[PDB]
Design a protein around this ligand. Structure first.
Ligand code: FES
Ligand SMILES: [K+]
Ligand SMILES: [K+]
Ligand SMILES: [Mg+2]
Ligand SMILES: [Mg+2]
Ligand SMILES: [Mg+2]
Ligand SMILES: [Mg+2]
Ligand SMILES: [Mg+2]
Ligand SMILES: [Mg+2]
Ligand SMILES: [Mg+2]
Ligand SMILES: [Mg+2]
Ligand SMILES: [Mg+2]
Ligand SMILES: [Mg+2]
Lengths: 100, 97, 137, 122, 86
RNA sequence: CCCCACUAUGCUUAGCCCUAAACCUCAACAGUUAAAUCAACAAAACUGCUCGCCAGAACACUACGAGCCACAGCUUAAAACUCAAA
């Protein structure tokens, strides 16, 4: 009675989410560069969001935040290209901090 | 076999196709008010579809209606009739800075 | 009220006035900006001529006529003769893309006239006469 | 077939305007037309000055005549309107309501064209 | 000639600012294509030459809009190096 | 070559003439994207089938013959001499 991969995939939160556009997700700040916050939210790629002007000092490494997802992976095919160009990061909007 | 395998079907999350603001509406050469919304106020020039946002079918219908109305005596050619300057702005163009 | 760049429409009831005169009553400065000359005629709203000046009538000759400072001088000359006749506010109708298109308007202002509107009437045929053949340079 | 006559009439008093409309609808009937409706769009300023029959016009009465006629009546009616001195401009078009508008599902997006050039290294 | 006058290509001057009115008019005529049209009409452009110009202008628009689309897409990556030293 | 003037001509009607880098220099129909992908460049490489066309350069959009409302024309189209290249 070993669970199959097809079963794991069907019942994963990422599969159950459906499309990612305009979906609220919880992220975690794992890397910070100046006012650039690198946030992991459970997907393949992280998103990079600028430090908010209000309560900027509350956003630190490990701080859990609320995001509105736009794309899991930013990719596009440009004129003459044989494959899609990927920037290797997700597109998301940082809304604020998640609190209990 | 296995219940958890994916099933073949059509995309359930597919968004409905977008429609032009004139989709499903009749474009008549006598409706000069509508046609005037797709000409330049200062020169009367017909706007291209990249400004009007119309589909190819309606860009043609609007264009043919404008040309018919102009030469039949319903619509001016060299300027937008001033009566229609306060109508809704549906075209994506700004002439003031 | 907010400013409208669109001119007042004749027959409608506007509140805009210039020295107690309506837009339909303001004299007109006709500027013809050619490639080799600039001609300026100021006329009344009833089409009465009031002043005429061109780069040629201001003593400029040949290629000097087709310059900005030459048109500016022609504008000042027409403004002077027009101001003597009682003109302060003018509607500018400029046809042509010559060098004296804008400079001719400056001369009208430096000459004491107030421009209340600018109209382009450069002739554009909608299909018309075949222009002369291109130049080999 | 079904046609629509867009009729711009000289700005006149009510009695002369009715005589012109009656004279124009009777001309259609004499040519075999079945007149369906007559609509008044109102007197208005023309979009531009129109010279017709040695006169200059700035205002006109806009009228529509919906009618059915044989195909050969159109050419004969156009000639009749050219001679009526009270008509500024008269045009006969195929009635727009006859043409049925096909349904539209929406805008089908166009993907960027692919494989226009070989993938060899240049 | 048969149309009403002082409606087409007419801009009103605000507070005696004639320079801004002329710039606005010039911007109107440019965006509507009249300036380039007037210039191209000074000498007759033969049809073969017109077709070549339109083709060149259309291919330039496609290239310029596609390069602009790629610049905007990659502009987010112009941020400071997150992994400096590695 | 640059500027000005003006004609044949560009337009209509009625007949001719039948030529273009008439070239998107990429024939029609049907099919494939796997194998060896493929001289180069150009607009990726091929299969079936059919018609048309091609066989060193130049002589030669020529000569002669023939046909044509064409009479300084068009279509078809060689040879001799010459070269070891084109
Ligand atoms: S999108 Fe349906 S008619 Fe324009
Ligand atoms: K040929
Ligand atoms: K070619
Ligand atoms: Mg001649
Ligand atoms: Mg003709
Ligand atoms: Mg061709
Ligand atoms: Mg060939
Ligand atoms: Mg064949
Ligand atoms: Mg095929
Ligand atoms: Mg040979
Ligand atoms: Mg030949
Ligand atoms: Mg021969
Ligand atoms: Mg012979």
């Amino acid at each position: 009675n070993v669970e199959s991969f097809a079963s794991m995939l069907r019942h994963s939160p990422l599969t159950q989410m459906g499309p990612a556009k305009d979906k609220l997700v919880i992220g975690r700040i794992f890397h910070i560069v100046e006012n650039d916050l690198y946030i992991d939210f459970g997907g393949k790629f992280h998103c990079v969001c600028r430090r908010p002007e209000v309560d900027g000092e509350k956003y630190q490494k490990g701080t859990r935040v609320r995001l509105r997802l736009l794309d899991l992976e930013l990719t596009s095919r440009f004129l003459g290209a044989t494959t899609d160009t990927t920037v290797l990061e997700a597109n998301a909007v940082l809304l604020g901090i998640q609190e209990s | 076999s296995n219940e958890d395998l994916p099933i073949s079907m059509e995309n359930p999350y597919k968004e409905p196709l977008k429609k032009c603001i004139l989709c499903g509406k009749h474009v008549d050469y006598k409706n000069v008010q509508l046609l005037s919304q797709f000409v330049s106020p200062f020169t009367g020039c017909i706007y291209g579809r990249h400004i009007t946002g119309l589909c190819g079918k309606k860009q043609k219908e609007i264009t043919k209606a404008i040309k018919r109305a102009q030469i039949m005596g319903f619509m001016p050619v060299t300027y937008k009739d001033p009566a229609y300057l306060k109508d809704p702005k549906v075209c994506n163009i700004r002439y003031r800075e | 009220t907010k400013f409208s760049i669109y001119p007042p429409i004749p027959g409608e009831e506007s509140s805009l006035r210039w020295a107690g005169k309506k837009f339909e009553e303001i004299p007109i400065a006709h500027i013809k900006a050619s490639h080799n000359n600039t001609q300026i005629q100021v006329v009344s709203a009833s089409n009465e001529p009031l002043a005429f000046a061109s780069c040629g009538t201001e003593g400029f000759r040949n290629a000097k006529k087709g310059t900005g400072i030459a048109a500016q001088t022609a504008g000042i000359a027409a403004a002077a003769r027009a101001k003597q006749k009682g003109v302060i506010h003018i509607r500018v109708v400029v046809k042509g893309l010559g060098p004296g298109r804008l400079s001719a308007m400056h001369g009208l202002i430096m000459g004491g006239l107030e421009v209340i509107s600018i109209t382009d009437n450069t002739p554009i045929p909608h299909x018309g006469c075949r222009p002369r053949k291109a130049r080999k340079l | 077939p079904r046609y629509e006559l867009a009729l711009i009439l000289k700005a006149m008093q009510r009695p002369e305007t009715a005589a012109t409309l009656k004279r124009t609808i009777e001309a259609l009937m004499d040519r075999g037309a079945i007149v369906r409706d007559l609509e008044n769009l109102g007197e208005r300023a023309l979009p531009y000055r129109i010279s017709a029959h040695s006169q200059q016009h700035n205002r006109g009465g806009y009228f529509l005549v919906d009618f059915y006629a044989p195909t050969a009546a159109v050419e004969s009616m156009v000639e009749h309107l050219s001679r009526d001195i009270d008509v500024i401009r008269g045009n006969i078009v195929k009635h727009p309501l006859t043409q049925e508008l096909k349904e539209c599902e929406g805008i089908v997006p166009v993907p960027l064209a692919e494989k226009l050039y070989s993938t060899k290294k240049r | 000639a048969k149309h009403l006058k002082f409606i087409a290509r007419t801009v009103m001057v605000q507070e005696g600012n004639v320079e801004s009115a002329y710039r606005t008019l010039n911007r109107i005529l440019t965006m509507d294509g009249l300036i380039e049209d007037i210039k191209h009409r000074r000498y007759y452009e033969k049809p073969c030459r017109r077709r070549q110009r339109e083709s060149y202008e259309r291919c330039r628009r496609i290239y310029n809009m596609e390069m602009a689309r790629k610049i905007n897409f990659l502009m987010r990556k112009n941020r400071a190096d997150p992994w400096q030293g590695c």
